[PDB]
Amino acid sequence: FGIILIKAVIVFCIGFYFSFFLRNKTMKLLSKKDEILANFVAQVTFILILIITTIIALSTLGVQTTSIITVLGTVGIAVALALKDYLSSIAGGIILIILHPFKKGDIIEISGLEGKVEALNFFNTSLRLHDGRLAVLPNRSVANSNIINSNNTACRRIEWVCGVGYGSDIELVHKTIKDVIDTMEKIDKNMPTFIGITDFGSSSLNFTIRVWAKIEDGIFNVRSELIERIKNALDANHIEIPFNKLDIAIKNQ
Amino acid sequence: FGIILIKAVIVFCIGFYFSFFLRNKTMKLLSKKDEILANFVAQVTFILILIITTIIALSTLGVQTTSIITVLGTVGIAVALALKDYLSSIAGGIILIILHPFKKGDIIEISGLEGKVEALNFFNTSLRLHDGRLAVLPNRSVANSNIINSNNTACRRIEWVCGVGYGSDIELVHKTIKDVIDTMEKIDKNMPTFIGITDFGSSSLNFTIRVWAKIEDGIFNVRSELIERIKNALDANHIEIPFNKLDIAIKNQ
Amino acid sequence: FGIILIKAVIVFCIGFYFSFFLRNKTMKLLSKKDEILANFVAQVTFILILIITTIIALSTLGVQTTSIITVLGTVGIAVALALKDYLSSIAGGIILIILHPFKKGDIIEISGLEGKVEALNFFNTSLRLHDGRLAVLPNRSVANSNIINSNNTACRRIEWVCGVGYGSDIELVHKTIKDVIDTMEKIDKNMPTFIGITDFGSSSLNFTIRVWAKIEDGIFNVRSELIERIKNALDANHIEIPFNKLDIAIKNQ
Amino acid sequence: FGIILIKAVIVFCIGFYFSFFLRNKTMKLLSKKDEILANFVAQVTFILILIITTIIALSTLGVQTTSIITVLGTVGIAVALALKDYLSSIAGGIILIILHPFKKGDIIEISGLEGKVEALNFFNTSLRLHDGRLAVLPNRSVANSNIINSNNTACRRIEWVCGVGYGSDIELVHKTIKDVIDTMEKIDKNMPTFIGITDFGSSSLNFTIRVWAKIEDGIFNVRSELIERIKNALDANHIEIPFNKLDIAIKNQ
Amino acid sequence: FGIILIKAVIVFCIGFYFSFFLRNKTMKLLSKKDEILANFVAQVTFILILIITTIIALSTLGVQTTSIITVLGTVGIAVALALKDYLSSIAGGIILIILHPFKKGDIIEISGLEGKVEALNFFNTSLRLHDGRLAVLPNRSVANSNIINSNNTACRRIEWVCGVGYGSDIELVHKTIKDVIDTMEKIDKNMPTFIGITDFGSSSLNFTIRVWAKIEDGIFNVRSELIERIKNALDANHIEIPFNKLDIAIKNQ
Amino acid sequence: FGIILIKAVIVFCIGFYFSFFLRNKTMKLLSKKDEILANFVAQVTFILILIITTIIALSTLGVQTTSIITVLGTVGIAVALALKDYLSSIAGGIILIILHPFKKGDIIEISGLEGKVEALNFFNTSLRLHDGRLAVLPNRSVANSNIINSNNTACRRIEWVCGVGYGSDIELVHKTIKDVIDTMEKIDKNMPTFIGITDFGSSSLNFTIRVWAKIEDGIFNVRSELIERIKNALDANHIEIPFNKLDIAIKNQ
Amino acid sequence: FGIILIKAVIVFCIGFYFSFFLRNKTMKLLSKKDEILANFVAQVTFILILIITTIIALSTLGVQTTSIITVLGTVGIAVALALKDYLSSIAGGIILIILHPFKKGDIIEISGLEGKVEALNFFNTSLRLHDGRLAVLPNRSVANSNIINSNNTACRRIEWVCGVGYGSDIELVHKTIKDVIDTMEKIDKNMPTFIGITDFGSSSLNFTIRVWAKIEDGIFNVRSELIERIKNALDANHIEIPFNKLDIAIKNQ
After folding, report:
1. Is the domain of E222 the same as that of E160?
2. Which chain C residues touch B166 with a CB distance below 8 Å?
3. Could you tell me if residue E13 is inside a domain?
4. Do C105 and C48 sit in the same domain of this protein?
5. Extended strands (E) in E178-232
6. Please, which residues 106-135 of chain B have a Cβ atom closer than 8 Å to chain A?
7. Residue ranges of D 165-204 with Cβ closer than 8 A to chain E
8. F165, F240 in Cβ contact below 8 A?
9. F136, part of any domain
10. Number of folded domains in chain G?
């Protein structure tokens, strides 16, 4: 009866050694990066090569391994699952790096959060915000949301709704602004300006100002000076900016 | 006992070479596009053709490869899974390109974000916004939301709720507007206008103005001038636009 | 040893030709519709018919194809997955077309977005809005939301909360409206009207008007004119519509 | 060598005819319902029975069909997937019809949307709303939300927060209402009433009125008349309903 | 050649009858419940036992049924999937009934919707609301949300933010309330009361009243009467409850 | 021909008995806990042991069981799926009990809902709220949300924004509070206090008060007394807490 | 007939003992950590090694184990599924620990919840909040949200919108602040300051102040003092900070 019975501990041990050489070529070509990693890829690659060796050695004896493989299968599957989201941050980065419509130094607006890019981690992306802290956005997140590059086009629009005296003229202000526009140093004339009465206001009339500028000096800055001159001028032309107006009627009871 | 034992390293090497020719016909008809790409499709196509050759070579020896194939399966599956979303951006595009109710130069409103289209990447779509930065919308997202083409129909409605002296006549204003409508240059007569009292207001009476215009020189221009003349006229007819009215009653305690 | 060694290149090629006749009966009964489509269904149908032939030909040699099949499988699966959502827009339409509670020319209100229907694409659905732009709603989206047909029933209710002098009588107004109701040309008498005091208001008393009308010439027109006469009459009966009333008490400190 | 080689076109054709008899017993006991349906179930049932007979006929030749079945498998799966949601509208209906806590003529409140039921489609459900349009709610949606039957219980509570002069008595009004309650024709006495001061108000004192009534005649009218009487009475008892009170203190600067 | 060819119509019919006895022992121990149910479980159990008999009979002939079983599998799978959510309402109920931290007669607040329980259907749960209509919540929904039993504990807290004259004393009101607390018939002394100044108010100072009561005759009653006494008392101690106070400063322009 | 034909009813019955002994060792070591459970685990364990015995007995006859196993699998799978979420409440608990960063008597804030813990059911978790009712939170929910233990750290911060006469001094109040702080019995000195001007207010200046206290006698009380002293003192130092200030300008029209 | 019949109870028991040695080397290497854990891994590893032994011993008899394995499979799968999310908290942590862009002592802002990190549990993460309670964030959650490290960059921006007399000069305040900036001890000069008129206000004009500071002493104190000096100075320069301005018009009716 003997050869099977022997062929088993022949095989079982033949591979069982190969658990050392592959726990230690795991530890050889990748270990001494971290304790956590050297003993995780050397624990798992090991125990795995082990359980494959056990299953295989029971197979040479003539045992039904269909039952164990069903368990190993349905194990491996809960594993496939834990790492779904992590590995999708990984191939998130793989696709990001490879196909990039984004690269380091650009500034963007991922999901409402705008900052200049600092890092393309294996799984993570890092922004140093205008706040100046560093957000660490997992690649998974990034690769699928609307990535809004601000850097990829050199000029950007600017806007207002500058409330006037609700009683000033359609063209008075239409020229005081058309004048302050020009007096601006930081402004483009090749890019149009749409400055009209946008809407009836509650206590003030509201003028939109659409203007363009260059990415280079602007941020928010240009808008702040634009207003500092459309004040210096609207204040100057005996043109009113109204505090909330209210029409009181009085009656006693 | 020998032939199996030999047929193994026969086979094993036979294919094992074929790891060079397909690491290097991977590197041959695809590489030199990028370091990342050339060593990723050449690392994976390789390591794969390798693990297939090992398994096959152990199969010629008479070994149960059901155990390893179960692991290879349940690996490949975690892989199937990481690339679900990416590859659904890809065939997103494929469908997008092929079936298009959209094409470059059109302006649309994908998910609240309106801009003219600049790019149909493999996975990505790019809009230069009216802001003027370029959003990079993954195809996945696009192929499944409500794509609102503004370009595919030549004319668009415009609207108001123009507040009036809450005491002015139902037909007075009904004609001052029917007059300013006509005096407008940029305005269609073949397309209806619905200008009636929409609602009782809190401090003002509210008139809707529904009007149509052409895509060609419209957007916002038309509406802003429309208002610039419905003020130039409503201001002109001794018709009041009210600041918020309030009926104070007084009593002491 | 020969025959299998030969039967391989027999078979392998036997089918390998059939890669041409099915690359080009792919290109024959389907191509010339587009470059993207003719070379996509002719690339894929091809490469596939190829990898099936390879696998088959290694099978006639006595090679374990379990390893490759497991990869082919786990590939095909990531594919099954990318097209989950697209193909569910497809059979979305299939169901939509087939079982329709909806058909072209009807107006509806899919997910808050109301417009007349213009297109039933294979995947997509198109509405020309009352805006007049054309939304392109993927079938996947439509087939599963509450589809609100406005066209399927000939008559629709209309409503108000018409604020009055908070001091006028429960029946005074109850008759001025019951009078303006009748004087209306565009109104149904077979459909009831529920006009009564709905709620105590903050500065005004609030009357609901529930009235019915016909789809034919309704929408905007009816409700706006109804108000134009319930003003022409309420203004006329020395019945007040109040601006926000406020009871000031005064005391110094 | 012959018989296999022959047994193939034997088999292959044997079933290959059965493509006609099952394209046309598809077209026989089901078609003529529609063009879309007669040629869809006759195209698919067909191409299916075809690809089954191909695979089978290559099987009688001794070919590895594991390759093709893997593809047929992983195809069928993307199909399983497109129709997940549709078919769950179907078995949505099956469970709905079968186990119903709802039936036609009842009025309900599915997801905030209340209307009387008009249809139980195979996948869809239809309500003619109070509005009078007909919503078409897919069975999938319905079978899983909180279905709120209003018809399944004969009596319903009604409510207020009736603001009073903030200075009137805890019992004065507590009786004026207990009196208007009784004077109501449309009200139940074996159903309690909880009419107490519910909350200190900002400018007014707030009384809750909890009352019951019958489903038969209460659509809006009961609450609306209720108030038409609690006005006819509160107005009458020299009990104030206040416009927003405000205690002004004055000081100059 | 005969026996196989015969063993087929032997087998095929042998089971084929067993389609009658199992369409009719489907119809025998389960039917006459409904028409929908008796012909659904008798259609399906049948068609199924049919397609199992066809496949088996082609198997005795030596035909490859790997192709058909792949389709039968991939069908059965689109089925597993339509009934994922329904059958999880079912085992929802199974777990609910079995492990209950809830049973009929208790009142709860599932997902913001509070009512006394009336039904534990197979898949559904029914509440008669304090509205008095009966919601029908599918078991799926219930077994997984926060089920907030109100009935499982005999006493419940009550609360206020009772605005005072912002000028009254920290302890004056602190005793008027400590006095109104005791004078209440419906209150617990073994359960603490936390009545302090909670927050500076905008126009009024704000006092929290935390008090306990018994489920038996509480709900709304106790709080409404508690307030009717803390008004009867606060109104009485020359302690002001203020209408919104405002400090007007005046200057002309 | 016999033995097979006999070996079937040999086997089939051999196990078929074993349906009794395992219906009744189901009923033996588990039943009498409930009727629902004794006849559910005794119905399912049974019918299952039955369908396995049928399939096995047709296998000894030489019948293709691949058909039926395909249905048994694809059934078992719609079952795996219904109990996904229940059994994840289960192993939710298993994990919760095992690795607890939480144990009974702690108070927490799971998803906005804060209460002291009363129960760790198999699947459920119960909190008696500060309300005093008992919520029954499924383990599934808990094991995955941010579990905010309040009990696990002995001291907690407290906060204000205490509005002051917008004209008072930066240090006046800065010391009146620094004094009331000290006068407090219930307060920690080893824990810092950050009491400065946080923000310009609309009608009042706003001071934050950050202070620490002990879990022992605190929560909300210490805050309420803190304020009763910072009123007793701020009221006392001729330091104003302002009612909303408003700067009226007057002009007629 | 014997040997099979014997080989069964040979095998069955051979492994059946091995249920003791692997229930008790489960209990040997792992047990005594807890009762829950020692009898859970010793119950499951056991019952499992048991059901594998039974299936295997019926296999050596010649029984079709395809039916049982289908059930063991489809069981194992509902198990794979319960532990999806838990095990993804596990490999969440594994990836967190190994790849960290985060480490203990850093402060972050995980999903709106900012606190210093105290724990990296196997599954959980713990923050002691500014509040000072300890939140217990499951790793699953963390590894996938935007982890915002505040600690990883040494300097942070600060901001305002400091309202001024709407009538003061564009440069008056532009210098009072540029002066208060400098007078500040805790402020960086190498980091820019953008102090301009950001927007027209309703009752006040609004100045943004963008300034930088150092992580080390800043918190929220540097802003509070900044303001305490921009008050000490703005108050000082006869520069008004306005209470809400309102332009009253009066007319009687």
Report:
1. yes
2. 241, 243
3. yes
4. no
5. 197-199, 205-214
6. 113, 119, 121-124, 126, 128, 130-135
7. 166, 170, 194, 196-200, 202-203
8. yes
9. yes
10. 3
